[PDB]
């Protein structure tokens, strides 16, 4: 819900999310929904964004309407920040547990230490039930099971109220007598030395000694109880395992790319060379969370968000099968209302008019090839 | 008599000398002045540096010494008409100082900018540096010191004490010249980018601010002008 | 013209320029001259120079005596800063259009974000004609052709003169009356409240309102005209394609390297092992823009600058053909007046007495091998 405002070229060339899947579209309270997919770190990472040396796999959502039970990059849990390598493809998996009823737009996002949020596609997930039914149990290494919704809440309230009461008692003790104007007049007109006299000093000594003694006793008691404590666990985690993708058998060279101002379409001319031994066909163009599909070649079945999915938004001038070894140049047009709804047309406002995306090529048997394209995007006005 | 034609000379000498300097650097900027290790660079810019430094030292010594030696011992027995004439002469000195300050801190400084942003600086003594740091800056320093000394030695208002605004106006812009050490140091070492707004240049900025003391200096000169011959007319 | 002053070791180990070529040596106004070649980023990049993460392909020249029409790294245009990788070799091409008559020393240079200028070899190029004949036409996406020499000059002059005139009018309006001493006396002696009276306030209100209204109207008019504008296009460009050089079949180990102080020669002892299947011979040693050639093995025909070219400056103790598989150790002396003219002898002043360079090995058929050498450079005094 935080994208459509970021720069179009920055959304195009940071991170490409694909193979996204959602386990469920509608859940009950305490029910789990799992989000899977892959993201590729673009080679032409913008210089204004710091390299993803420190990155965190986050969830885009309006507060804890879900709780993040687990999150994985590769196959290993990532509760801390992680290091990503430019040009590598990683697979991710986020497990969410429903907490608050309603209709929520859930995004998978990557926060980069020096570049800000990179928001992936968002999907509407319905939560039904009552928040009062939500439980977040956890078992500690000390052998006790607690609910994270209310654990330590009573202790926190008690201690804060106790110290607030001590401070209020001090202030009220001094506030029983007249406060401002008579004391000001006494201090000004001659030496005061009358508004602070025993047993006021004795009361202050008692307050100070009691404060120190209570702090020490409370610390000792909180050490006898909970004798086993550990510090906060933090630190960027290295050695994220990237996907070992096979080398693509399709090479694509972008010969100019244009978009009409104003308009809802993007046009580019591609020289596609088919290696390997199977006839390929262009089935998809993904630019920034928007999938332009050639419906005659490929159809989406993973429940991709409709406002981000162009079922027939990809038109190829000659999308006949490309025989192996054969090279041809075609005009590819990606047109959909999403191009203007998600403000991908506002790249005219950007200080770097370059686009990047993913082309998905499909053969007859159905196996697909992913190739990455990037080129300057030239607006056309007449 | 009062204000005489010394003001015309004060303007014209700086104008003519700096126009000739600009012609010289236009002729020898490229072509004996790009390569700091070429023999022609030594004959056209290192010799210029040596000659200008020697001449500046000699001129400063002679001018300041003459102004101090010819100081008026009997300032008490100075008539108001003579005081008015001396005030006008001091104003001519201040005009010369302002003209020299312009030529030094605006013209040749931004000329140093346009030189360094377009060539690769080869030394601490590029032709631009020779003209700006070691000619125009010493010239305006000499003029400012001479104006201050003239005020102190001929004007009773500026006598019997060192005027703080005049001292700041005279010494702060002078501090730009030793600040060149920061310019060279933070350029060879700190900051290899030609960035004209780099903090290595804030030494010029800070001591360029001290020229704002001309405001207090000028109200002091206004009061000195309006001592005996303040009018009447003005406030009457 | 800016080298010969930089540190000798820094000039030796930053970037090695070779295969340099110039399309023409003498040009007319508006005529194009093209500079081609390769540069290799040295592996032992000095720590005092920031890594070439942000680098710009520039031209060393005395102001716009040429205009940079095009510049390429790899095969793609690079009008912005680019990212280079240490140890990689890139090919470059700069297209220059003559603008100012004269004899100009044109250098190809690489500016690095945190290290300053790396100046390559410079070549004297003669320009003949008149500057008045120079044209720099360009066609915009709005369908108009303008000359960049004078486009918008009239508008800039007009607006600056207009605003300067407004300010001068304000100052002169207040300067018609006496300025400094009577006003100072009026302000000092009693309350002034007489030198600023109507209609002075009305004139100031008119000035303020007119200024705001004129700014707004001028902005609106400059928006109606030129309705299509884009921001400045900036940003470091990643994904520079390096040359895929074959692995060299020659391995060279430097066993000590010395230079006489004072002197014009550098001596080094190399252990050369010939792999592959052809007899090789040492033909060139390039250290910092200076090419020491063994004239019996190789001759330069690309018009390399004479002051940087040592035709017989490379003497090898035994430069007989090196049979494949054979290893021999020879004494190599690189001697030329350039070693002192370009102050390569001043490495004795440097805080890091290490050299780097390129050795070019040629076989009988003429195909060449490039090997890189780097070692400490030990001065000798007696
Ligand atoms: C506050 C005190 C300031 C003191 C410093 C003053 C610096 C003066 C210039 C230094 C020159 C140098 O050093 O160079 C010496 C130059 C080198 O040129 P050249 O190779 O002989 O060519 C022939 C000479 N042309 C190229 C000038 C034609 O020749 C000279 O003899 C000429 C120097 C003339 C300086 C006086 C004229 C100034 C303009 C007129 C209004 C005053
Ligand atoms: C208002 C201030 C006036 C000062 C005038 C200058 C007096 C110089 C005395 C002799 C010093 C010397 O000869 O030695 C200085 C040494 C030279 O070093 P070198 O050339 O590298 O090698 C050694 C070569 N010897 C053995 C032949 C010397 O150190 C330096 O590099 C410092 C030189 C920069 C001086 C900057 C002065 C700028 C003055 C500007 C006036 C408007
Ligand atoms: C009593 C208070 C006086 C203190 C002032 C003393 C001068 C400080 C010297 C710094 C040396 C140091 O500390 O370290 C030196 C560091 C080491 O960096 P490097 O790894 O070589 O970076 C390599 C980058 N190059 C290649 C560009 C160097 O270079 C610096 O970053 C210099 C920082 C600038 C500090 C000077 C600011 C002066 C302020 C002037 C404004 C009027
Ligand atoms: C090549 C260098 C030539 C410099 C000539 C300096 C002239 C001598 C300075 C001087 O004392 O006064 C010259 C004029 C007129 O003032 P004078 O009345 O001569 O000064 C003394 C005042 N007194 C007569 C009542 C005792 O006062 C002025 O306004 C002269 C201004 C000259 C401009 C400053 C030039 C400095 C360049 C470095
Ligand atoms: C370099 C940076 C300058 C540092 C700033 C310190 C000076 C600021 C205050 C000042 O200018 O006062 C010194 C006198 C003014 O008169 P006084 O300070 O009252 O003392 C006069 C006696 N004295 C000449 C020996 C000083 O003024 C003079 O007498 C100067 C003229 C005499 C010097 C001439 C010789 C110099 C040749 C190079
Ligand atoms: C208030 C500062 C005036 C600065 C003017 C200037 O730098 O002039 C040099 C420039 C040089 O260009 P140009 O006139 O074509 O003569 C070229 C001669 N060289 C190359 C030696 C400067 O133009 C002039 O000489 C005009 C004269 C203006 C008198 C106030
Ligand atoms: C009043 C504002 C001063 C801010 C200083 C500043 O902008 O410094 C930038 C610089 C950052 O260096 P950078 O801009 O990256 O320089 C790039 C070029 N090199 C690496 C050659 C210096 O930081 C420092 O080195 C410390 C400055 C101390 C000021 C008292
Ligand atoms: C002046 C008060 C110092 C209190 C120190 C208490 C130490 C208790 C150790 C558990
Ligand atoms: C590289 C970060 C440099 C930060 C400089 C801060 C300057 C502040 C001046 C008070
Ligand atoms: C107080 C003056 C504010 C001026 C605003 C003008 C807005 C014009 C929109 C084109
Ligand atoms: Cu959303
Ligand atoms: Cu990608
Ligand atoms: Cu040169
Ligand atoms: Cu190299």
Tab-separated table of N, CA and C in Angstrom, chain A residues 157-221:
chain	number	residue	atom	x	y	z
A	157	UNK	N	2.819	-3.316	34.251
A	157	UNK	CA	1.851	-2.372	34.794
A	157	UNK	C	2.121	-2.101	36.266
A	158	UNK	N	2.387	-3.156	37.038
A	158	UNK	CA	2.607	-3.003	38.470
A	158	UNK	C	3.808	-2.113	38.749
A	159	UNK	N	4.938	-2.398	38.101
A	159	UNK	CA	6.143	-1.629	38.392
A	159	UNK	C	6.000	-0.179	37.945
A	160	UNK	N	5.413	0.045	36.766
A	160	UNK	CA	5.234	1.417	36.306
A	160	UNK	C	4.296	2.189	37.225
A	161	UNK	N	3.190	1.564	37.643
A	161	UNK	CA	2.270	2.220	38.563
A	161	UNK	C	2.933	2.497	39.905
A	162	UNK	N	3.755	1.566	40.391
A	162	UNK	CA	4.437	1.759	41.667
A	162	UNK	C	5.367	2.965	41.616
A	163	UNK	N	6.189	3.055	40.568
A	163	UNK	CA	7.129	4.171	40.500
A	163	UNK	C	6.409	5.490	40.243
A	164	UNK	N	5.359	5.467	39.417
A	164	UNK	CA	4.558	6.667	39.216
A	164	UNK	C	3.924	7.122	40.523
A	165	UNK	N	3.446	6.172	41.331
A	165	UNK	CA	2.865	6.509	42.624
A	165	UNK	C	3.905	7.108	43.559
A	166	UNK	N	5.131	6.580	43.536
A	166	UNK	CA	6.194	7.153	44.364
A	166	UNK	C	6.453	8.604	43.973
A	167	UNK	N	6.573	8.866	42.670
A	167	UNK	CA	6.794	10.236	42.221
A	167	UNK	C	5.640	11.160	42.568
A	168	UNK	N	4.409	10.682	42.379
A	168	UNK	CA	3.231	11.478	42.710
A	168	UNK	C	3.176	11.753	44.206
A	169	UNK	N	3.583	10.781	45.024
A	169	UNK	CA	3.615	10.987	46.468
A	169	UNK	C	4.613	12.070	46.843
A	170	UNK	N	5.796	12.045	46.225
A	170	UNK	CA	6.782	13.100	46.462
A	170	UNK	C	6.207	14.472	46.112
A	171	UNK	N	5.632	14.583	44.912
A	171	UNK	CA	5.103	15.863	44.456
A	171	UNK	C	3.963	16.332	45.353
A	172	UNK	N	3.056	15.430	45.730
A	172	UNK	CA	1.943	15.821	46.583
A	172	UNK	C	2.380	16.208	47.984
A	173	UNK	N	3.378	15.501	48.523
A	173	UNK	CA	3.958	15.882	49.802
A	173	UNK	C	4.437	17.321	49.761
A	174	UNK	N	5.126	17.696	48.685
A	174	UNK	CA	5.538	19.091	48.587
A	174	UNK	C	4.410	20.026	48.163
A	175	UNK	N	3.317	19.492	47.627
A	175	UNK	CA	2.223	20.308	47.123
A	175	UNK	C	1.114	20.538	48.139
A	176	UNK	N	1.176	19.915	49.318
A	176	UNK	CA	0.163	20.207	50.329
A	176	UNK	C	0.214	21.671	50.755
A	177	UNK	N	1.415	22.217	50.920
A	177	UNK	CA	1.578	23.622	51.247
A	177	UNK	C	1.390	24.480	49.995
A	178	UNK	N	1.234	25.796	50.157
A	178	UNK	CA	1.156	26.673	48.981
A	178	UNK	C	2.404	26.554	48.116
A	179	UNK	N	2.211	26.673	46.802
A	179	UNK	CA	3.218	26.217	45.850
A	179	UNK	C	4.018	27.353	45.223
A	180	UNK	N	3.362	28.240	44.474
A	180	UNK	CA	4.102	29.093	43.548
A	180	UNK	C	4.338	30.514	44.052
A	181	UNK	N	3.279	31.277	44.292
A	181	UNK	CA	3.450	32.719	44.468
A	181	UNK	C	3.977	33.049	45.863
A	182	UNK	N	3.405	32.515	46.952
A	182	UNK	CA	4.009	32.790	48.267
A	182	UNK	C	5.441	32.299	48.389
A	183	UNK	N	5.765	31.140	47.811
A	183	UNK	CA	7.144	30.659	47.867
A	183	UNK	C	8.070	31.553	47.054
A	184	UNK	N	7.609	32.013	45.888
A	184	UNK	CA	8.397	32.943	45.089
A	184	UNK	C	8.660	34.235	45.852
A	185	UNK	N	7.628	34.768	46.511
A	185	UNK	CA	7.793	35.994	47.284
A	185	UNK	C	8.738	35.785	48.461
A	186	UNK	N	8.642	34.634	49.131
A	186	UNK	CA	9.546	34.349	50.240
A	186	UNK	C	10.989	34.248	49.768
A	187	UNK	N	11.218	33.595	48.627
A	187	UNK	CA	12.579	33.467	48.111
A	187	UNK	C	13.123	34.826	47.687
A	188	UNK	N	12.298	35.641	47.027
A	188	UNK	CA	12.759	36.943	46.543
A	188	UNK	C	13.016	37.909	47.696
A	189	UNK	N	11.994	38.168	48.509
A	189	UNK	CA	12.111	39.128	49.598
A	189	UNK	C	12.902	38.534	50.754
A	190	UNK	N	14.209	38.775	50.767
A	190	UNK	CA	15.068	38.252	51.805
A	190	UNK	C	15.426	36.797	51.577
A	191	UNK	N	16.265	36.287	52.473
A	191	UNK	CA	16.631	34.882	52.434
A	191	UNK	C	15.416	34.025	52.775
A	192	UNK	N	15.279	32.899	52.075
A	192	UNK	CA	14.089	32.095	52.313
A	192	UNK	C	14.266	31.216	53.542
A	193	UNK	N	15.097	30.181	53.425
A	193	UNK	CA	15.583	29.363	54.544
A	193	UNK	C	14.476	29.015	55.541
A	194	UNK	N	13.237	28.979	55.054
A	194	UNK	CA	12.106	28.735	55.940
A	194	UNK	C	11.119	27.755	55.323
A	195	UNK	N	11.124	27.658	53.995
A	195	UNK	CA	10.208	26.765	53.306
A	195	UNK	C	10.764	25.358	53.146
A	196	UNK	N	12.047	25.158	53.439
A	196	UNK	CA	12.639	23.827	53.467
A	196	UNK	C	13.309	23.639	54.822
A	197	UNK	N	12.587	23.034	55.760
A	197	UNK	CA	13.095	22.781	57.099
A	197	UNK	C	12.625	21.413	57.563
A	198	UNK	N	13.390	20.818	58.478
A	198	UNK	CA	13.019	19.539	59.070
A	198	UNK	C	11.570	19.575	59.540
A	199	UNK	N	10.833	18.499	59.277
A	199	UNK	CA	11.389	17.242	58.784
A	199	UNK	C	11.350	17.057	57.265
A	200	UNK	N	11.382	18.155	56.504
A	200	UNK	CA	11.418	18.029	55.049
A	200	UNK	C	12.693	17.333	54.590
A	201	UNK	N	13.830	17.686	55.193
A	201	UNK	CA	15.083	17.024	54.850
A	201	UNK	C	15.045	15.550	55.229
A	202	UNK	N	14.419	15.223	56.361
A	202	UNK	CA	14.289	13.822	56.750
A	202	UNK	C	13.408	13.056	55.772
A	203	UNK	N	12.329	13.683	55.299
A	203	UNK	CA	11.461	13.033	54.320
A	203	UNK	C	12.211	12.800	53.015
A	204	UNK	N	13.011	13.781	52.588
A	204	UNK	CA	13.788	13.608	51.364
A	204	UNK	C	14.843	12.518	51.516
A	205	UNK	N	15.518	12.466	52.669
A	205	UNK	CA	16.474	11.390	52.911
A	205	UNK	C	15.783	10.033	52.890
A	206	UNK	N	14.601	9.943	53.499
A	206	UNK	CA	13.841	8.709	53.436
A	206	UNK	C	13.476	8.327	52.015
A	207	UNK	N	13.049	9.305	51.215
A	207	UNK	CA	12.706	9.034	49.822
A	207	UNK	C	13.911	8.513	49.050
A	208	UNK	N	15.066	9.162	49.216
A	208	UNK	CA	16.267	8.750	48.492
A	208	UNK	C	16.709	7.350	48.906
A	209	UNK	N	16.794	7.110	50.218
A	209	UNK	CA	17.225	5.805	50.706
A	209	UNK	C	16.250	4.715	50.290
A	210	UNK	N	14.946	4.984	50.395
A	210	UNK	CA	13.951	4.000	49.999
A	210	UNK	C	14.021	3.719	48.507
A	211	UNK	N	14.235	4.751	47.690
A	211	UNK	CA	14.350	4.537	46.253
A	211	UNK	C	15.526	3.625	45.930
A	212	UNK	N	16.698	3.924	46.495
A	212	UNK	CA	17.877	3.104	46.210
A	212	UNK	C	17.668	1.677	46.710
A	213	UNK	N	17.156	1.539	47.934
A	213	UNK	CA	16.973	0.217	48.524
A	213	UNK	C	15.945	-0.599	47.752
A	214	UNK	N	14.855	0.037	47.317
A	214	UNK	CA	13.825	-0.669	46.567
A	214	UNK	C	14.350	-1.087	45.203
A	215	UNK	N	15.141	-0.230	44.553
A	215	UNK	CA	15.724	-0.615	43.271
A	215	UNK	C	16.630	-1.828	43.447
A	216	UNK	N	17.480	-1.804	44.477
A	216	UNK	CA	18.399	-2.921	44.700
A	216	UNK	C	17.632	-4.199	45.025
A	217	UNK	N	16.637	-4.106	45.912
A	217	UNK	CA	15.865	-5.285	46.294
A	217	UNK	C	15.077	-5.841	45.118
A	218	UNK	N	14.476	-4.965	44.310
A	218	UNK	CA	13.723	-5.417	43.149
A	218	UNK	C	14.634	-6.086	42.130
A	219	UNK	N	15.831	-5.534	41.913
A	219	UNK	CA	16.774	-6.179	41.007
A	219	UNK	C	17.185	-7.550	41.528
A	220	UNK	N	17.456	-7.654	42.832
A	220	UNK	CA	17.835	-8.943	43.401
A	220	UNK	C	16.700	-9.954	43.282
A	221	UNK	N	15.466	-9.520	43.546
A	221	UNK	CA	14.319	-10.415	43.437
A	221	UNK	C	14.096	-10.858	41.996
